[PDB]
Amino acid sequence: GSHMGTEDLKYSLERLREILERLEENPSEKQIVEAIRAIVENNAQIVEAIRAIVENNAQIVEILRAIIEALEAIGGTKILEEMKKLLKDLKRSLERG
Amino acid sequence: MGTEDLKYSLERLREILERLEENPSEKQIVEAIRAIVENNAQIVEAIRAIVENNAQIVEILRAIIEALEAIGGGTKILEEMKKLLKDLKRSLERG
Amino acid sequence: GSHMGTEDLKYSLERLREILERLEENPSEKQIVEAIRAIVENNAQIVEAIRAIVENNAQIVEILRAIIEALEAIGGTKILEEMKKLLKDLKRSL
């Protein structure tokens, strides 16, 4: 269901190992399918986690930009130019949708 | 985080997929599933390390805003950074 | 083929869901390998996205590293000393 955090990944991962145990001991077609249904369900929760992390990175970028502005308004420099370069580069290579 | 264990896991999974496609067998299917579970293990671990590192980044951002406030006081930029940071805190990926 | 962003995971995951529905309705050895194939594809996009995020993480830490420098040159401290510790831990992790 709705994603609550990384602990969701653990509970689906550990349940994934439980299904694997049943598989190695008592193989069966229905069980191979069961394990695949579980992997899918596990992957859908991994995507949500990565999605949320990507949005967090985007928000962090905006905060870093505002910090640069505040630093420029306060102290007016070489380091400031260096930071803006990194932020530009990060903006260019940022993982997004 | 570190990604070698991830790529090392994915490459093995890739090769295992090759055999299964070549000689579809129950043992090879199970061998592939075991590899996927192991790949998802490194994935989930790498995601956990990114989340914990973000949490510390959020804390460093808080200290930064304080260091800026101690030097400069009330600015529109500060209300902006704080409002932004609060929105990042409400939506941070957590446990 | 070429990783373009998290939208790639969403699409491949949806293909993977689609391959599952057929597998479950009418199982067979063909669809099983089809499903696994799609899992490896989705996992590959996932690893790529994660690899890019870890890269972003490194660049962010550098920007914070340069900021703390800028703060030191401007205002001389405890909070900076505190910020240097958090960063050191974070730099150690990566």
Author numbering:
A (entry chain A): -1 to 74, 76 to 96
B (entry chain C): 2 to 96
C (entry chain B): -1 to 74, 76 to 93
Anything the authors wrote about it?
The interaction energy between the flipping helix and the inner helices in the short state was tuned by combining hydrogen bond layers (“A”) or hydrophobic layers (“X”) in different orders in each of three possible positions. Designs were given three-letter names corresponding to the layers in order, starting at the hinge proximal position. We constructed all eight possible permutations of two different layers in three positions, dubbed SERPNTs (in silico engineered rearrangeable protein topologies). The number and position of the hydrogen bond networks appears to determine the state which is populated—designs with one network folding into the short state, with two networks, into a more dynamic short state, and with three networks, into the long state. The hydrogen-bond network residues were closer to the computational model in XAX than in XXA, likely because they were buried in the former and solvent exposed in the latter.
Inspired by class I viral fusion proteins, such as influenza hemagglutinin, we chose homotrimeric helical bundles as the fundamental architecture. We decided on a design scheme with two divergent conformations containing a constant six-helix bundle “base” and a variable portion with three inner helices and three “flipping” helices. In the compact “short” state (∼66 Å height), the flipping helices fold back to interact with the inner helices; in the extended “long” state (∼100 Å height), they extend to form interactions with each other.
